[PDB]
Design an enzyme around this catalytic site. Structure first.
Site, mmCIF file in Angstrom:
data_model
loop_
_atom_site.group_PDB
_atom_site.id
_atom_site.type_symbol
_atom_site.label_atom_id
_atom_site.label_comp_id
_atom_site.label_asym_id
_atom_site.label_seq_id
_atom_site.Cartn_x
_atom_site.Cartn_y
_atom_site.Cartn_z
ATOM 1 N N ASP A 91 4.177 -12.701 -2.302
ATOM 2 C CA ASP A 91 4.762 -12.856 -0.981
ATOM 3 C C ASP A 91 6.222 -12.408 -0.980
ATOM 4 O O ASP A 91 6.580 -11.550 -0.175
ATOM 5 C CB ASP A 91 4.539 -14.273 -0.435
ATOM 6 C CG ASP A 91 3.070 -14.674 -0.325
ATOM 7 O OD1 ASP A 91 2.185 -13.957 -0.936
ATOM 8 O OD2 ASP A 91 2.784 -15.693 0.387
ATOM 9 N N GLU A 144 -0.971 -24.514 -8.352
ATOM 10 C CA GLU A 144 -0.822 -23.163 -7.839
ATOM 11 C C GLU A 144 0.109 -22.352 -8.734
ATOM 12 O O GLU A 144 -0.042 -21.153 -8.883
ATOM 13 C CB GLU A 144 -0.211 -23.256 -6.436
ATOM 14 C CG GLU A 144 -0.203 -21.933 -5.682
ATOM 15 C CD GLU A 144 0.157 -21.952 -4.196
ATOM 16 O OE1 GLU A 144 0.308 -23.039 -3.601
ATOM 17 O OE2 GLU A 144 0.304 -20.864 -3.634
HETATM 18 C C1 LIG Z 1 -1.143 -22.029 7.268
HETATM 19 C C2 LIG Z 1 -0.748 -22.941 6.091
HETATM 20 N N1 LIG Z 1 -0.654 -24.280 6.153
HETATM 21 C C3 LIG Z 1 -0.285 -24.771 4.917
HETATM 22 C C4 LIG Z 1 -0.036 -26.090 4.405
HETATM 23 C C5 LIG Z 1 0.340 -26.275 3.052
HETATM 24 C C6 LIG Z 1 0.671 -27.683 2.499
HETATM 25 N N2 LIG Z 1 1.172 -27.801 1.271
HETATM 26 C C7 LIG Z 1 1.499 -28.999 0.780
HETATM 27 C C8 LIG Z 1 1.358 -30.147 1.590
HETATM 28 C C9 LIG Z 1 0.862 -30.006 2.883
HETATM 29 N N3 LIG Z 1 0.549 -28.767 3.274
HETATM 30 C C10 LIG Z 1 0.495 -25.148 2.212
HETATM 31 C C11 LIG Z 1 0.256 -23.865 2.719
HETATM 32 C C12 LIG Z 1 -0.142 -23.666 4.084
HETATM 33 N N4 LIG Z 1 -0.447 -22.534 4.832
HETATM 34 C C13 LIG Z 1 -0.418 -21.133 4.346
HETATM 35 C C14 LIG Z 1 -1.800 -20.514 4.025
HETATM 36 C C15 LIG Z 1 -1.777 -19.232 3.165
HETATM 37 C C16 LIG Z 1 -1.355 -19.519 1.728
HETATM 38 C C17 LIG Z 1 -1.915 -18.487 0.764
HETATM 39 C C18 LIG Z 1 -1.711 -18.864 -0.741
HETATM 40 N N5 LIG Z 1 -1.650 -17.864 -1.471
HETATM 41 C C19 LIG Z 1 -0.297 -17.267 -1.477
HETATM 42 C C20 LIG Z 1 -0.221 -16.198 -2.602
HETATM 43 O O1 LIG Z 1 1.049 -15.551 -2.688
HETATM 44 C C21 LIG Z 1 -1.213 -15.135 -2.335
HETATM 45 O O2 LIG Z 1 -1.074 -14.197 -3.472
HETATM 46 C C22 LIG Z 1 -2.562 -15.694 -2.286
HETATM 47 O O3 LIG Z 1 -3.553 -14.656 -2.054
HETATM 48 C C23 LIG Z 1 -2.698 -16.822 -1.225
HETATM 49 C C24 LIG Z 1 -4.112 -17.405 -1.297
HETATM 50 O O4 LIG Z 1 -4.143 -18.145 -2.527
#
Ligand SMILES: Cc1nc2cc(-c3ncccn3)ccc2n1CCCCCCN1C[C@H](O)[C@@H](O)[C@H](O)[C@H]1CO
Length: 765
Positions: free
Chosen positions: A538, A735
């Site tokens: 990212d 992660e």
């Molecule tokens: C909309 C949304 N609500 C979220 C909520 C929490 C959350 N956290 C703790 C406590 C509470 N809530 C965390 C995230 C949240 N999101 C984003 C969703 C996309 C993330 C992708 C992760 N990842 C990023 C990698 O860089 C990429 O390479 C990879 O392909 C991808 C898939 O693994």
């Protein structure tokens, strides 16, 4: 014969607990069909159950942990849920029983044990929620003998084109059922299992929580209207016990209240099979699935030194089961901007502002419906298909059951549009959408993601060159079946290659740029001032400002991965003309990686842009990106450049931490800045590529053999031990990992590519 293994695979894989977005439920791989889900919550007051009830997966202070201890999608498995809020240790055992014509049968045991902290007389409400979508399908609760509910088992009888006739039983179960002495018991019974059978329009049946609560609310409204009040109130658990009303409908709520520990079974019997499924069958199939799981694990994931110990076996089984146990079936429309607004070409300076404007036209519309069968990174936070994640997920899954992995590859490739695009993030249907802000749902036909699925394909090909058990390997044991699979997939692989070259092309010819090839140069579309989301990394630092002349060395390396794969697969298929094209492309990428991205001054690969003065400039930020030609397997084992990369890789003051390789060098000006996502933390997927390539250099004659042998040894050890120590302490896969402290940080339950650790331990690549 290929379509014979195909039919058998379909029948094998049809049923599963394929709803990883919820603690526990089942669905077949059919868009519009029968689905089940579990809910449970303590009730101590008149208003608490809305807050304690559990259904969709989360992770917060109130949940110690949960996950699969064993799982195989052909057979079933066992999940453990540790719930602090509700003072309950839960086990959900799921097992499949082959037979008949409709994908077989299955059964589940739900067991709840209060923990030591809970009041020994806790009331826990338990709901089994059943729905069925389909125009010409039917489902009916057989009514009970008793006046107010069920003393024994609840039988649902149903039918559809897809499932034929079936019965689904919820057994009476074991445990204390509380009894009310209130007046209400003359109209609602003293306390017993109840069923409400309802109908709502098909598209909302997935909304189990609200549907259940609307019924609870009607029950309470009935209390109020009928003079049950605070002068003499019935007990909470009776206020929240639905009035029994079984019937036909497309929704059936089965509710029980237990006091203390409890358990009950769910028996799904496909009529077209033998006799119906019993509890004795459930218990025997459970014992059997464990023995089979046990024996396949030790063959497929044979842990090498120094991780041969039982603590590491337990660790590996946990990491593996969570990965393969997150497999879901998703179905519905997705949200796509199909404008192809010209601003998405990103041809001008300042392109991100123009693209923002085009997104502000909100031309996106729902399309499909689509289906996807896939593993996912995260049950609690993002339980859906991500394109480059899936390539990492399938590496251990393919070891386990190559046929399953091909199933999932095919599933992804069936999403590809006429141009060669697959959306990087697959949010299929209203249920999937519910867990995603509207601003983040829209997919963009110009956004790529790494083609890591080619890696799984490469593993398959080496294996092809060199009943449930038989099926898991049918596609490599029957080489004709193998090649037929590649024959049908190959055109799509080629489409995606061409798509990459048409949509993610960089610009050589228009600057003062010199290079062996005029063609080979790539730039990820979709970059913002601080991000490049489509690359997978990212916020790894990129040329500032972003610029139509940018070139990204990771993208060129991914294209190199693709051609190399197409050479292999073309050859297998005799696509002689295709193979010679691919050959000239590979050769060109090999030269152009050097001419456009190699920095002699820095000793590593770099992204590039163009200057204020319109000249080619390398922009170097030492970290994962710098090693990419190495990680993707493009360098010759004797390459001087490789030698320098190995030096940067092993250098403690740059990338090498006690805990794995840092995503970015401690020496980079962007180390630990901003959100610090890919700007220092250790990530298991890239460390895994590093490990595989060090092992490769290490097991061939060459000048770096012994250096790579040492680096391989240590990095395998560092990465494994860090993920193990965190798992021991927290129960979680994380992660990413902190390179200063070794602590897991960001998101828990990341299985998810963290689970690559099983393959790292088992070795012999
Ligand atoms: C909309 C949304 N609500 C979220 C909520 C929490 C959350 N956290 C703790 C406590 C509470 N809530 C965390 C995230 C949240 N999101 C984003 C969703 C996309 C993330 C992708 C992760 N990842 C990023 C990698 O860089 C990429 O390479 C990879 O392909 C991808 C898939 O693994």
């Amino acid at each position: 014969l290929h379509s014979e293994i195909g039919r058998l695979n379909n029948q094998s894989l049809l049923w599963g607990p394929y709803r990883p977005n919820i603690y526990f439920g089942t669905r077949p791989r059919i868009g519009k069909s029968l689905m089940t889900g579990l809910m449970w919550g303590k009730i101590e007051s008149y208003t608490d159950f809305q807050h304690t009830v559990r259904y969709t997966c989360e992770q917060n202070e109130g949940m110690k942990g949960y996950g699969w201890d064993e799982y195989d999608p052909r057979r079933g498995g066992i999940q453990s849920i540790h719930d602090i809020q509700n003072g309950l240790d839960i086990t959900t055992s799921f097992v499949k029983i082959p037979g008949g014509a409709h994908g077989g049968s299955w059964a589940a045991r739900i067991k709840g044990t209060l923990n030591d902290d809970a009041p020994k007389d806790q009331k826990t409400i338990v709901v089994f929620y059943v729905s069925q979508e389909g125009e010409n399908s039917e489902l009916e609760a057989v009514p009970s003998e008793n006046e107010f509910g069920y003393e024994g088992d609840v039988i649902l009888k149903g039918r559809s084109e897809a499932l034929g006739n079936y019965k689904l039983v919820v057994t009476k179960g074991k445990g204390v059922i509380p009894q009310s002495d209130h007046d209400l018991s003359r109209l609602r019974g003293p306390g017993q299992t109840v069923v409400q059978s309802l109908t709502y329009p098909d598209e909302v049946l997935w909304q189990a929580k609200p549907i259940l609560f609307q019924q609870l609310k009607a029950g309470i409204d009935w209390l109020v209207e009928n003079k049950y009040d605070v002068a003499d109130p019935p007990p909470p658990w009776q206020v929240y016990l639905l009035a029994n009303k079984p019937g036909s409908g497309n929704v059936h709520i089965v509710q029980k209240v237990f006091e203390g520990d409890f358990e009950f079974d769910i028996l799904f019997s496909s009529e077209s099979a033998g006799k119906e499924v019993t509890s004795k069958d459930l218990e025997r199939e459970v014992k059997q699935a464990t023995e089979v799981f046990g024996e396949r694990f030790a063959r497929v994931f044979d842990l090498k030194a120094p991780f041969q110990g039982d603590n590491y076996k337990k660790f590996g089984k946990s990491m593996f089961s969570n990965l393969i146990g997150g497999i879901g079936y998703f179905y519905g429309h997705s949200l796509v901007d199909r404008s192809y607004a010209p601003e998405y070409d990103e041809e001008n300076e300042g392109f991100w502002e123009d693209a923002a404007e085009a997104r502000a036209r909100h031309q996106e519309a729902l399309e499909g419906p689509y289906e996807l069968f896939t593993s996912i990174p995260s049950r609690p936070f993002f339980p859906r298909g991500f394109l480059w994640d899936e390539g990492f997920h399938l590496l251990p899954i393919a070891d386990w059951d190559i046929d399953l992995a091909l199933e999932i590859i095919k599933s992804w490739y069936n999403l590809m549009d006429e141009d060669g695009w697959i959306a990087r993030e697959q949010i299929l249907g209203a249920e999937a959408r519910s867990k995603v802000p509207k601003e983040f749902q829209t997919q963009y036909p110009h956004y790529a993601n790494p083609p890591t699925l080619f890696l799984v394909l490469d593993n398959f090909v080496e294996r092809l060159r060199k009943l449930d058990e038989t099926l898991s390997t049918a596609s490599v044991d029957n080489p004709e079946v193998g090649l037929e699979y590649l024959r049908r997939l190959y055109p799509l692989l080629r489409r995606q290659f061409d798509w990459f070259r048409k949509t993610q092309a960089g610009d050589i010819k228009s600057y003062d740029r010199e290079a062996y090839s005029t063609k080979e140069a790539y730039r990820w579309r979709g970059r913002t001032v601080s991000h490049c989301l489509t690359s997978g990394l990212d916020d790894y630092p990129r040329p500032q400002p972003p610029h139509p002349g940018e070139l990204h060395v990771d993208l060129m390396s991914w294209v190199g991965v693709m051609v190399k794969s197409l050479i292999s697969i073309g050859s297998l298929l005799g696509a002689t003309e295709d193979v010679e094209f691919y050959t000239k492309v590979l050769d060109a990428i090999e030269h152009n990686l050097d001419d456009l991205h190699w920095s002699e001054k820095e000793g590593c690969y770099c992204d590039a842009t163009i200057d204020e003065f319109e000249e080619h400039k390398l922009v170097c930020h030492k970290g994962y990106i710098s090693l990419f030609p190495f990680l993707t397997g493009l360098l010759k084992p004797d390459s001087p450049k490789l030698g320098k990369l190995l030096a940067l890789i092993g250098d403690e003051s740059e990338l090498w931490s006690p805990y794995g390789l840092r995503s970015l060098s401690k020496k980079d000006e962007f180390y630990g800045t901003a959100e610090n996502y890919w700007r220092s933390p250790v990530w298991i997927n890239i460390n895994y590529l590093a490990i595989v390539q060090l092992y490769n250099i290490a097991t061939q004659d060459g000048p770096y053999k012994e250096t790579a042998r040492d680096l391989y040894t240590r990095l395998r050890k560092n990465i494994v031990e860090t993920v193990y120590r965190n798992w021991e302490e927290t129960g979680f896969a994380w992660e990413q990992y902190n390179p200063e402290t070794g602590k897991g940080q960001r998101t828990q339950h990341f299985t998810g590519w963290t689970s690559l650790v099983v393959k790292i331990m088992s070795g012999h690549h």
